[PDB]
Amino acid sequence: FVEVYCTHTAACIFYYLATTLPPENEGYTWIGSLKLGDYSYENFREIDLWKRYTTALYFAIVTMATVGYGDIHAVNLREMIFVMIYVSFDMVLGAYLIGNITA
Amino acid sequence: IHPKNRWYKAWEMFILVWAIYSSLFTPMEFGFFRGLPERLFVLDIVGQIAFLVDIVLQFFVAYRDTQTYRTVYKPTRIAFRYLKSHFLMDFIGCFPWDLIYKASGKHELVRYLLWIRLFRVRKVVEFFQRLEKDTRINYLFTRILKLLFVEVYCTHTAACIFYYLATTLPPENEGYTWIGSLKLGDYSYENFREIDLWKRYTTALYFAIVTMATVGYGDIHAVNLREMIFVMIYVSFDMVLGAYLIGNITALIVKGSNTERFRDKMNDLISFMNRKKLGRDLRSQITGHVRLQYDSHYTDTVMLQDIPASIRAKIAQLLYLPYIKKVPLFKGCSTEFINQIVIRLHEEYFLPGEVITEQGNVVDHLYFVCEGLLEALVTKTDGSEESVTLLGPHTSFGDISIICNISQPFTVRVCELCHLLRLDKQSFSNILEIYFHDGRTILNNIMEEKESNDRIKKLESDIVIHIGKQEAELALKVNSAAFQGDFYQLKSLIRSGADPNKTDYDGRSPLHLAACRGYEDITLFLIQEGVDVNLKDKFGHTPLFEAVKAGQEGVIGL
Amino acid sequence: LIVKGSNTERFRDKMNDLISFMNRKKLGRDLRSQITGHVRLQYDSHYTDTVMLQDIPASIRAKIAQLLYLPYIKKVPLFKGCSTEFINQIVIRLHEEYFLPGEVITEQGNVVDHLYFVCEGLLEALVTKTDGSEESVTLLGPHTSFGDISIICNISQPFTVRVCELCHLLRLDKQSFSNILEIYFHDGRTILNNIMEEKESNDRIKKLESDIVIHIGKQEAELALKVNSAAFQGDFYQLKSLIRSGADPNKTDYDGRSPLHLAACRGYEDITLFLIQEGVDVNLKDKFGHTPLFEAVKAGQEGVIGL
């Protein structure tokens, strides 16, 4: 449960980090530059909240799943370090889960 | 300088700060920046002179040799071994090579040899070896901390190596280089060299961590074949390191805590208890008993094997001195006897409803109910509903069964949670026979609670016969001591309370024996003691007869 | 591999456990934290010994101890025993210990239950005094023995021993020594002769020479007296245990009376018969010159006279 909550908060803070930059240089931040499957949602603010939540959460537990499709990238420098920290903490936590189940 | 010093300790903290700074710094000069700025070259020479001061202190450390287990402060041997161990390696790194690089026209050989400064990480790892030595932190917890630190250090070094290899390629082929053509987002890192050092540092480290956490992420991939081979080695190393991390985390928690073991036994015991469906007080009784046995076992074993007799003696003294002093029977005897009793004590806890020894069995330990209330009963296999004075806290019991050598004249049972003291027969008997004065004192105490304690009054016949035998043997002892002079010993036993009036079995009174031997000093000492002069032996011989028989005029005159 | 662990892991784990327990006992951090630490390191070597000794069927360990422990004691002039069959038993019950500097083994004036032989290392032995200042009567050395003389004397041994160098000592329980002595009384006589030789030879035993002489003078007195008393009361178990402890039935009391005389005057039959089995003499003359027959017919017991 604590792991899942950590993932959710990671997704939320990640979307906020995307929001940090002004409307200009929308391409420079990760959102608005994906253009996956012809959706090309450049203007994230215009898009309804639910889809944005889905996309951010997907990336958060895909990094969590230690799989990494690579559709979404931490392109900007500002949030770039955030994925670093999040994945490291995730490594420790996943290892702890493996240890607990092994016990 | 000496290792056990405050200033020494304050020195190594600065040493390790400088050490981690230089350890991280070495990749910073090797990659992300060709050459060095004069700005940081100053910090470089500052760190190098700090390392020189460190190596000067390294010259004289007076470390303790492991084989000796005793510190040696002689300079020459400390030099001969410790300098060879570390100073030789340190010396190469100590020389600042940025100047040589500039003098040699930034020759690649100098940069390759610059890696020697990385060797100082040994001081950092030695610091954590000392951290591990501290008892407070968990061993496996310390180990996992070490693994995390080492993993981070290795990953950062790989990230720096990635850019150094990229810059090693000629500037013309920017596209073929990975950083030249990675194009993250709308922005393109077309020129790695002109973009800020940090902008490149962030991207290179991100690539290394992506592999370390095993999430591929697509995104950046090695483009250069030179880049390709390095990635292979890095990931191969990282897999085993992460595997070690998994194993250590598993092993840290596979060790069940004392609470964990206790809860496991609670689980299976309540499962069985529910099978029977008895419930009620019984569940509580077993639960309390089992938790108490864990707590007691914790106490017992560490005393049994971890701590030697001399060492355990001190803690026994501190823990049990008031406990033994409070007991009335032990009061009135010399201090050394009390200490001897204390330093061969044990620990016992008990619950309501348990019998330690049944009536008629041979007693094997001496007990004192320090805490709680206990019921002593004369209930036996043949007969029931027989009870005697309840034993309160700080009351000894079983002393009558041991001193009088009677095998448990009653059944002793505990009635609630009590704290009990256990002590063996052999050591107690030896202590008693060594210290007879304390033995009489205690027996006089036994006389004191006589006709005041029902249990003692019931068994008082055994104590009476025991004191009769003790007085008989004491009379024999004083007669023997008077035989071989021992004027001081006779005086001491008089101070000990020995009655000179008592005679031996032969009727040989101390005056009789003094006359027979002819020691007039003993004769006058017994005279001023107050014993009647006219006495008879088994055959009725008066001391005048033996005084004449021996032939000394002094005893006859007295 | 990690879960299997190492002896170091158990070492640290037990460190944590009893350190936590001592902290819950609120013991002083300066007083014993180091001592526990010091002894703890030496225990690391001996845990293997403990595991083997519990595991082994006790014969092979006897052989290995014979290989190693026997030479050390043979080197020691003290406790030679003047025979080799007797010493190997001592080896098979013998245990070993390491130490750290500035450590006190035995406190003054305590009943000793552990017998220490300095197979290796240097020791200093000092005696308490009324002033309390320590006086080092002797400096002990490798392949020596201390505290055995105390058991021979039965004295409280008011001696403090402090290590002066790296040392290996052997720890022996008093009871095992008593048992081996009762098995071999003659070897006890031989070691008594060896001890009376050292009393001239060595300073510490020369310091205790007054005690050695007095108690040897004393010890005989109780032995003859005690058997006579136990013959007087007639308790057969105690007297026979004492007489099989090494007491001489022919030894006489201060008046010269024998346990046979007291048994006859009391008139008990089984004591007299047992003493007959012991080859007790009858021609013995007391200060009054009494013979067992005389008091046997004085008291009036037919069985003793008939025998």
Numbering used by the authors:
A (entry chain C): 206 to 308
B (entry chain D): 58 to 615
C (entry chain A): 309 to 615
Manuscript excerpt for this entry:
Tetrameric reconstructions of AtGORK were obtained in two conformational states at resolutions of 3.4 Å (AtGORKFL1) and 4.3 Å (AtGORKFL2), allowing de novo modeling of 662 of 820 amino acids (residues 58–720) for each protomer, while the remaining regions were not resolved due to their intrinsic flexibility. The full-length AtGORKFL forms a tetramer with elongated cytoplasmic regulatory domains, with its architecture showing a symmetry reduction from four-fold (C4) to two-fold (C2). Remarkably, ANK repeats from two neighboring protomers form a stable dimer through specific interactions mediated by their protruding loops, creating a buried area of ~1,500 Å2. This dimeric interaction is specific, corroborated by another structure of the full-length of AtGORKFL2, which retains similar dimeric units despite of variation in their tetrameric conformations. Our structural studies reveal that ANK dimerization in full-length AtGORK is directly responsible for reducing its tetrameric symmetry from C4 to C2, maintaining an autoinhibited state. Thus, the current AtGORK structure likely represents an autoinhibited, preactivation state.
GORK is a shaker-like potassium channel in plants that contains ankyrin (ANK) repeats. GORK, also known as guard cell outward rectifying K+ channel, is the only outward-rectifying potassium channel in guard cells. In contrast, GORK activation causes potassium efflux, reducing guard cell turgor and volume and in turn stomatal closure. Each protomer has an N-terminal transmembrane domain (TMD, residues 58–313, containing helices S1–S6), followed by three cytoplasmic domains: the C-linker (residues 314–365), cyclic nucleotide-binding domain homolog (CNBDH) (residues 366–510), and ANK (residues 511–724).
